Amino acid sequence: GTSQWLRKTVDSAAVILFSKTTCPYCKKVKDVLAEAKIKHATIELDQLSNGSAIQKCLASFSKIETVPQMFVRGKFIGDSQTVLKYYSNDELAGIVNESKYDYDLIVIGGGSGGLAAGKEAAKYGAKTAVLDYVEPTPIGTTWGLGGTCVNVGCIPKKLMHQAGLLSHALEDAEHFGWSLDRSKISHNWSTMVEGVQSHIGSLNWGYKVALRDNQVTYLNAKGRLISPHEVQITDKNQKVSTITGNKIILATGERPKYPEIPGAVEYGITSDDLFSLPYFPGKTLVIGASYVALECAGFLASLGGDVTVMVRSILLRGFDQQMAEKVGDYMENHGVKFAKLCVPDEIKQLKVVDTENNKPGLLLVKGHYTDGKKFEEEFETVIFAVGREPQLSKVLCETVGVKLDKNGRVVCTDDEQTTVSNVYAIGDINAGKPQLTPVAIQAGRYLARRLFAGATELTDYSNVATTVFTPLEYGACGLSEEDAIEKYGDKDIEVYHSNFKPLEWTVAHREDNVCYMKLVCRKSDNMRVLGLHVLGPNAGEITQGYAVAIKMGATKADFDRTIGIHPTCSETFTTLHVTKKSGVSPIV
Template sequence: MIKESKACGFSADETAQFEWSKLKGMRDAYVKRLNGIYEQNLKNDNVVYLQDTASFVDTHTVKVVLDDDTEVSIKAKKIRSRWAPSTTDGDPRWRAGTNSDGFFDIKKQPRKVAVVGACYVAVEFADMFHALGTETHLFIRHDTFLRTFVPVIQEKVTAEDSKGVGSVEVDTLLWSFGRAPELDKLNLSVTKVAQTGNGHIRLDKYQNTNIDNIYALGDVCDRGYELTPVAIAADRRLADRLLGGQEDAHLDYSNIPSVVFSHPTVDSLGLTEPAARQIFDDENIKVCNFSFTAMYYSMLEQEEKGPTSCKLVCVGKEEEVVGTHILGIGSDEILQGFGVAIKMATTKADFERCVVIHPTSAGELVTMK
């Protein structure tokens, strides 16, 4: 924004020094304060909170070994299993770098970094490094520029694709290619809880496992949404059902909005165009596409302007909107409101009946043809 303000008549100094250590300290203090608030709220509600990894003894009992080696056993009528991050300690190749949990343990801003992975977190961290001035290399598998990679010890990444083998020297190596449920520590076998082939816990729509008194929440589930707000939403509905007398309370996993917090942000809600065409006949699908330059960039030189693109995927004679996808500045804030509309089975005609707020990028979604 300092750079872009010049186009609006401001005389701004672009050489302002950035202090990585100050950002890290402020961030660490914020997280500590936030966690303290949550812990205090639990105490206020007379909740006993044990922060460690639990494991099953039987279908009604779990045990927790605390830092001082004290073992605590807990019997319960209902047991909920939550996800814990997998680590990269088991394979010596991973020790050359850190993972996404260790991002803010980096004490000094790297001059050059390699981020390995193509998930949300990988893209977001690579984007942050790049925006802060670190030379950033993002390594991706599958159908883009990198199909296989072979990590080696020390501060080097060796990559192999169809064109051969190459390497890049970096200060920091960050692994971020997704996570897996850490079920091995749960001793889940004593419960006979059913799992999928890729190690997640098999559930029905009520978060029930195949064992009557055991439920699962979060990334450990087989629902396919590894997002914190999804876990929280499922938790609330489960509590409403088990403790609040709402017998049919459950999370509807359709039309869940998600955002990649890159620059610019990229958002998705509902069906993509290919997914919609797999489910419905082509003649029942109508797609609206529109790309434009947000007015925020109107004073900037062309090469400094950022893109904005929107897509609506509509189905049937009523043109119900079943997919909304946005790339561009502020798109994360835009999608939340439209997310409510999509959950209410909004049609394209409903969008068009809404009066445009001008000048906004959000207004473009209600005028698309």
């Protein structure tokens, strides 16, 4: 262990200091490096069990066994006496800047993962470049630094979801004794959009400042890996140039798919366009049944929209199907219409989008049902949410040797390594991994720590918790019921479940037995919780704490002996007793 770890650490770290907490010579270097503003990784050997073994192994790299020992890019440079001697002639700055490449790290893609990796790498003194370019949508929509998450993903989505939730809050308020007014109140799409885009703008700038303050070179350019250490860039003026980097992190993310039909690219929009849309969508058709499709359709209906969802087969493919049905049922009972077992054939333009009046055009949607029957209806806006795809053919030359799977995603090892050794991939482009922001963040941060700070900790991709932000939120963590049954057998699976109602909904006169939760369990493994599922308000806030417990290997008994907090929705998980095999109704 010790031998292998040290070689890899020395060869990969840009600037690293092997040290002990109780040393005046180590402190003299630390104070010098802080004064010269030279960022570095610090390994306190007296804080490690194999610290004494490492010192003897350090002799193979430096000839000495004492501390401190400073290394720059796989090379020993000197001890405390020598480092302070270099600092005396003002030569140390040039030594730590000496490199074979332009950068220790090039990050292609300035999104969640890419920014997390870049910022973390810079902490330990790696010269880092972050490349970001936003290719315009068919209709020319572009945005700033931050990736999908900040600009056209989680952030604007949840803000518009909140705007939708306040519709219900306005209704509830009367029952709770507030004078209004709810029928005489309307929503303004433009007021909301500008507020949301104003917050997006501050994050765009926030990241630009963060990279600057962490001394990370930000380039607004399109990157292309032409060789393992060479990245071709293209700036705003179409200048083509080549930069070199020791390690390459690919974090280019995904973009929405378009079905191969006439009219789609011309007359339809995606989530990329919706969040900055100058006009209110109006009568809207959402083609697709992903979480994006349902979330978007969800708030649009809550913002006084005539919304139809066109579903090819099932809702939320990949998610628990019982839970998916309940998500849809709520939406259908609160305005959202569904065109079941339906696919589109073409979109004909009936009216052109009025730019100078902030109004949508008009589109004729032609499609067909599974049986063969025809679909024909007029919509003001058609939103495609039919999936998301990586576009690595634009990013990656075939000659480089980075292997991609059937879906065009980068095949990685458990430490994010591509088939090219110095090249890594994180985020949505990493095959088989949950496609979520914090996954990209943990991946990026941890990778940067392993590369430049000698860390060993890998990212755990199992039991990653999710929340679908539909009108009624759906939070999950672990396996679906059908997956657990398939993996272990029906006789080994016990499902505890209960309907419930938020206390806030009682006075507000909202429907009983709409909120549902369940625990999927393995009987032969001391009733181990394999999956947690909650449909209700703040389902994300509910699920999070439990994801830690499931990680630790929570059983049903661990839930039972914990005491609930009253009055909350979440406390219901602490007292579940009704099983599915008993057949007793989950109602309260």
